[PDB]
Symmetry: C2
Subunit: 366 residues, 2 copies
Amino acid sequence: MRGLSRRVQAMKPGVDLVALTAGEPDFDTPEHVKEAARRALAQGKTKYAPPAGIPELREALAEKFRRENGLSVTPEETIVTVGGSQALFNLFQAILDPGDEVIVLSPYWVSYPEMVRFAGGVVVEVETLPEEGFVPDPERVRRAITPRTKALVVNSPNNPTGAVYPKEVLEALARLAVEHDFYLVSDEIYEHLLYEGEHFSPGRVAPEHTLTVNGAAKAFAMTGWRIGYACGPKEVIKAMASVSRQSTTSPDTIAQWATLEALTNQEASRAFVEMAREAYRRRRDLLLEGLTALGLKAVRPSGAFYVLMDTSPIAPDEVRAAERLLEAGVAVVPGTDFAAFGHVRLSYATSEENLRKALERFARVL
Amino acid sequence: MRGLSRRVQAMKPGVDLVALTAGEPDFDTPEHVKEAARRALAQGKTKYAPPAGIPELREALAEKFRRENGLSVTPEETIVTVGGSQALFNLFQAILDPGDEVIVLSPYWVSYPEMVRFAGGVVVEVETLPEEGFVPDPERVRRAITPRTKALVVNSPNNPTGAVYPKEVLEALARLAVEHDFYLVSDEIYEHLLYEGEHFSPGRVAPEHTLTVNGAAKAFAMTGWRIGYACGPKEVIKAMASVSRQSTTSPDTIAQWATLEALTNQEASRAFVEMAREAYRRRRDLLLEGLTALGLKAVRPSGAFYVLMDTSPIAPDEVRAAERLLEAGVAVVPGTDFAAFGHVRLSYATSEENLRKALERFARVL
Ligand SMILES: *Cc1c(COP(=O)(O)O)cnc(C)c1O
Ligand SMILES: *Cc1c(COP(=O)(O)O)cnc(C)c1O
C-alpha cells in the first residue's frame, strides 16, 4: 500500500515592505571562521566525520561548557549536530516513548511541540504571563507534572519573548526535575545575545537531569552552516549520537573545523559578539522607545533579538493585525504558532534605518 | 521519569595495518567544487536555506534526473538533504507506520534495516545469491509481498556486493510495486561508479511509485560535505521536506552552492568522474587478479568500489576470518552486519600500492 505515515500527516503547516520577521543575524559570519573554512578546504578535510563530531571539536566543546557555563562535562558528554534543531530532534527521539509528556512554556518557539509530537509525545503547556515578564512561575509548572512527565523545556534567553530568566527561577525548575525525576532541556542558543542580567545554566546544579542545547547559529551569525551542540548525561548523549548515525551520519566536516576556530579563537569571537551585542542593544532601545511613544505595549526583552508586541489596538486578533500591518508596509510574524495570541513577533536583526521606517508606518496605522 | 526510548534501545551497535575498509573515495573533492564553496563564502551565502533546498539546486537536480536518468521530474519533485542517508531516513519517517513491512535484499547496506526499524517498520529479508551474481530474482521478491508491504529497497550499483542489476530485473521489480501498490526506493548513489553495463533508473517505468535517492558523496568525493538528493511523487517529497524542517531545518548553504557547481559544470565534473572511474577499474582488476591467484573466491563487481570475498578457506566464520586477517596485518569489514555471512567486504578506494601490500599479506592466512 502507498500513502504517508501518521506522524507526517499529523504535522502542522512592486510594494515596498519593511521586514521585521528575521530569525537570524543580519551580520555575516566573522572572517576568522570563514578563514578556518578556507584552510579546511585546502587541507582536504572533506571526508566523513564521527557521528558525535570530530574529537577536536568535542574537546573544545567540553572547554566552552565548563569555562562559559560552569558545566562539569567531559568530551564524551558532548555532541555536535546539524544545527541546534537536530540536537533537540535527536534528544526527543532518544527519550520519548509514545505517550510520554513534555512540559513546554508558552509563548514557545514553534518547533518544540512539533518535535515532541513527531516522536509520539504529548505536549503539556504551561503559560507565562506578560505581566510577569514572561518568566515562568515554578508554582504553575508544578501543576503540570504528572507520572508521565519525561521532560521540561526551558528556553532562556527566550524566542519569541526575549525574556532572560533569573537564576532563582532556573534553580527552582532544576529542583522540580530532580524531585520528580525528569529531564530538564535547556535551550541556551541565545546566551551571548544578552543586554542585562546573567545567563545561568541549570546544568550547574543538576547535571544528571539536564540536557543543555546550544550552537553557533545565533552567536556567530552561522545559521546557514548548520552546526549545533549539546551536552548532558553520557547515556543520553550516546543515544543522540546513535540517531545521528542512522539519519545524517555526521555534520558537514568543513563546518565543524570552521566552528572549532570560533570556539578556540576566543579573542576574535569575543570581538564579534561584543560588536553584535552593542548593535542589537541600540536597535532594541530605538524600537522600544518608538513603540512606547505610539502607546503600543511590549515587554522589554533582555536577550535574543525579538520583541513581542500586543496587537489589541490594531485588530481583534494577531492574524488580522498582521494583515493590516502588511497593508501598511510592515511584515511581522503573528504570535499564533508560538501560542502568543494577541501578539505579533518583531525582530530587530535589521538596520536602524529599517526600524525607523517601520515605526513611521505603525504610526500611520494608528 | 527519566530513561531512554525503546526505539533508541532497540538500535544495534605499534602494528602496521593496511585498511581495506573505506566507504568513501580516497580522492579529494575536485577543485571546481571547492572554488564554488569559496565564492559562496565570499558572497555571504551563510543564511538559512529553504527546507527542501535552495531553488537553484532543485532546478539543477531536475535537469540532472531528466538528463542523466531519463526521469521526468520538476524542481518541486526534487529535494536536497544532509547526505543520501538523510533522504532515506526522512523517506521512511514519511511513509512508515508501525507494523508496515519493508523488503530489503541481502546482502544490504547496514543502514537500511536500522532506518526501517527506527520508524517502527518490520524488516522482511529477501536473499540474493552468489551463484546468481547477487542479482535479485523477481520471483523470490514476489513471494515476500504481503498486504503489509509498504516498500521494497533496491540498491544498484550495490554496496557491499558491487553488483549492477540489469534493466530487465529493475523493470520487473518496478512492475511488482505497481502491481501490488507499494513504494519502490531506488538507492542510486553509485551510478557513476560503473565499469560495465549501464545504469537504469526504475523510476522510468513506475514514476508515481518510485523514490530515487542519490547524492554527491560517492561520485564527486564529497562524503564530508553531507549533500544528498531525491526525487519522486510530489506528496512524498513535500512530506520529506516537512521532516527536514523539524529536524535539520535545511542542509548547509555553502555545501548546497558547491553542489550546484558539481551539477552544472559538466565538463569539469565529467573529467573528474572519468578520472576516478578509470582509477577504480584499474584497482578492481588488480585486486581480482591477485585474489584469483591466491585461490580466493569473490563475485566480480561491475560497480561501486567493493568486493565481497568468500572467507571459507580462512576461518569457520567471517568474524574469525576478519580477526585472522587483522593478525596478518589487513583490516577488512566482516559481512555480518550486511547479512553477508561467510564473506568479508573489501574496499578498493585506496592506492594500488596498498592493494598490493594487502594481497602480499593474504598469503599468511592460507
Ligand atoms: C535558532 C534557534 C535554535 C537552533 O537553531 P539552529 O539554526 O538549528 O542551530 C534553537 N532554539 C531556538 C529558540 C532558536 O531560536
Ligand atoms: C554512501 C551511501 C549512501 C549515502 O551516503 P551519504 O554520505 O549519506 O550521501 C547511500 N547508500 C549507499 C549504499 C551508500 O554506500
